[PDB]
Design a protein around this ligand. Structure first.
Ligand SMILES: [Zn+2]
Ligand SMILES: [Zn+2]
Ligand SMILES: [Zn+2]
Lengths: 331, 331, 331
């Protein structure tokens, strides 16, 4: 929904309402919880044409919970020059999300390893991102990004980070996409004080393949982290980071013409060398679900998580299944 | 204010600014308090036409305090089919508000028994509501709704609830409306732990008549609750629910052509079998007030509460008068 | 960006995204801090034409932090009559900001003495403001305002205030503006309980000159306060108000045609008769900075604060420099 178009400036307002309910046994010990999870979104996107070759842009988006959970998701501005690329700064996706966003396609769940405020894998504040598409207008399909992560010292370890760099490479050909991304940063003094996880530097990287054509969507991600994945020991009420993780995400979806979109997926996340515990799974589930698209504005969906986590998990990660049911209006 | 109209999708943005001040003696012991109460509202309403017979819709609205008090008020989406009715899920009005909203017409106050997060009587999160108007297109004026209330377990008893059902019937003829509504739900374990109120099931119901024609508005509500009205003993700092309440609300207003709209009202709420106290009034006042409408966008108002609560109230409910003065811009 | 124009009602939606980073040594002991400070703004402005001579209006604006700091900035409505003036009530600027806003022109910093929730000098809630421009349509350039400040009793002393009055006079001629403003109010019981600052009445006043023409901007402010400037003793973790302050702000800026806008400024704030301390500076710095305007929608900026505060400051006010870098998209 555009609200302004004059002097080469465009503004688009957008938002959605999501009525959303989670079902689990009784649901402290489930994958997703139990109860109401309804929320709304509001944001704008602006693009201004400064000259023939240069464009300016900003974007904001907020999450309002309708059930705590109220969050800015995007807040950034930047410039794009003809074939040199684009620069922007703000709260934006980490560059490793260039890989991980390949499998972030399920109706409600999925994307379990794209934590917010976790350096590079997800929704993070204070990142400057240089981006180049089709490699200086020379090689169509080939894209790359480099990103500087500013130091964020905050009250909790979970949401803090030090100075860091990362980058991504992508190639997109005949309906396929392959991607690799890597990032490293300093850990804050407070993080290194935490019980779990130890090391001066944190690191995250992932690769990915996707196929997005002929009403099919199929994507696979492999990632590894060092000292970067936040974990909590629900038994001893201890927090920190996992020294190493190894994560696999697979998704397969097909889009029927009449608007039904079934989905199957798998997610497995394993921490290694966790202080006190050793090897323990963080995430392990299959997902079967479907979305029904009535049109570009309206949809409903059901998202079942068959949880492979064992009830005897040592970190006390929840072992029960959760199904989400959701109805969505967006503009 | 519509911002989109193409492909049978409409989006309306709306909001208002309310400059608002309350006056009381000195005002801990007043009906309404004392000081600034200014606030703003923002929301959207969308409607998409899926086919000949089916429509999709969503709605969101937020309250921003300008003086804590920041709240989502509506967040829901749903579908409406030609003469079968409508279904929606989200944060919405309880179905008992179908009755109580008859007397919710005063400039600033009123509607004292339509608590938020109180099962069925007001603004509540996690409700699926089926609605039918003109009874399958057969009997004009006759409407009914049934509603399922999902279990909401939260940190305080006041804002939690268990699984529940409710319904409403309404008839609207020659300027009149009559309505009855009823709802029952399980109380959470935490609620039953509270000092005040005891019982496994909570219940609320109300009836109402209104006359809304010839520039007149006249409405009466009677309600009763069991184990559902939140009460606080300000003497002993004790909380819970009233075992029984009996509530009466009357309103009478006339709209002058030149934009003045005087208003008189009465509200009385009595709790019975309150643990330790017995019978005690929660609300007891007369209201005299007026709104001046300059047009569809601008208005000011004054709202005087003559408080009948006695200073010796045993729950320490406040006994002093409050007048509100308010100026409002809306679009 | 206007979204409505029919029946003499106009609504303008507006907002901006600001990617913003502060740089300081290591930055507890700096002027501005250190890290990400990105934020977004959203607001509307409405104007309705009631009759030939009378107009209604409302305005709201919110600040969303993207890094706590989420705030309503404006929320008010009012009426303007042909040559009698205008009245409005809400969260608005104190009338002393009529003076202080002259020097509030730097890219990111500046305006250090226009505290929010500080009676009269800045962003304050619960003020009714009468305003008259060109003195009843008789003397072009000559303007005045009188303002009543309602009592705000809150949990902290810093953000509370009692009943008060203030006013301002302004003259604007051939590119110049001169202004004087004054305000006085009661201090709340809680404020008078604080360690620092003592007196029953608080007072603030300031004068100002500005020159705003030929691509130049030049402004000077002098102010004094009594018992109104909030100060904190970071050594002993003590709070309150300064018994007296004396504040000077100077700014000089030039706007190049091609969009560069260099800026130099000076700010000095001195508290006197501070309980335990005596005479101590609160603010003391030079600013050199520049903004680059690409157009009416896009801009970037750098803002350097050369901090004159001494490391041996007795209130433990921070002594290090801070440079801000920022990119801005607005509509
Ligand atoms: Zn995002
Ligand atoms: Zn409502
Ligand atoms: Zn302001």
């Amino acid at each position: 929904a555009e609200i302004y178009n004059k002097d080469g400036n465009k503004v688009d307002l957008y938002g959605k309402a999501v009525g959303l309910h989670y079902f689990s046994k009784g649901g402290e010990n489930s994958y997703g919880g139990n109860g109401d999870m309804t929320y709304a979104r509001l944001g704008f996107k602006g693009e201004t044409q400064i000259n023939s070759d240069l464009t300016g842009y900003g974007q904001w988006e907020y999450n309002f919970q309708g059930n705590t959970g109220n969050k800015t998701r995007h807040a950034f501005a930047g410039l794009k020059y003809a074939d040199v690329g684009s620069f922007d700064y703000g709260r934006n996706h980490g560059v490793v999300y260039d890989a991980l966003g390949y499998t972030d396609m399920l109706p409600e769940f999925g994307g379990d390893t794209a934590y917010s405020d976790d350096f590079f894998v997800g929704d993070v504040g204070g990142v400057a991102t240089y981006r180049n598409s089709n490699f200086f207008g020379l090689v169509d399909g080939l894209n790359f990004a480099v990103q500087y992560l500013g130091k964020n010292e905050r009250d909790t370890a979970r949401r803090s980070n030090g100075d860091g760099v990362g980058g991504s490479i992508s190639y997109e050909y005949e309906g396929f996409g392959i991607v690799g991304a890597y990032g490293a940063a300093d850990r804050t003094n407070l993080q290194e004080a935490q019980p779990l996880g130890n090391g001066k530097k944190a690191e995250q990287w992932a690769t990915g393949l996707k196929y997005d054509a002929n009403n099919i969507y199929l994507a696979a991600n492999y990632g590894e982290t060092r000292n970067a994945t936040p974990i909590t020991n629900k038994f001893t009420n201890t927090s920190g980071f996992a020294n190493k993780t190894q994560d696999v995400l697979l998704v397969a979806q097909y889009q029927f013409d009449f608007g039904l979109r079934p989905s199957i997926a798998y997610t497995k996340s394993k921490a290694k060398d966790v202080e006190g515990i050793g090897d323990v799974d963080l995430v392990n589930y299959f997902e079967v679900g479907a979305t029904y698209y009535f049109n570009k504005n309206m949809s409903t969906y059901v998202d079942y998580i068959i949880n492979q986590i064992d009830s005897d998990n040592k970190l006390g990660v929840g072992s029960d299944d959760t199904v989400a049911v959701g109805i969505v209006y967006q503009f």
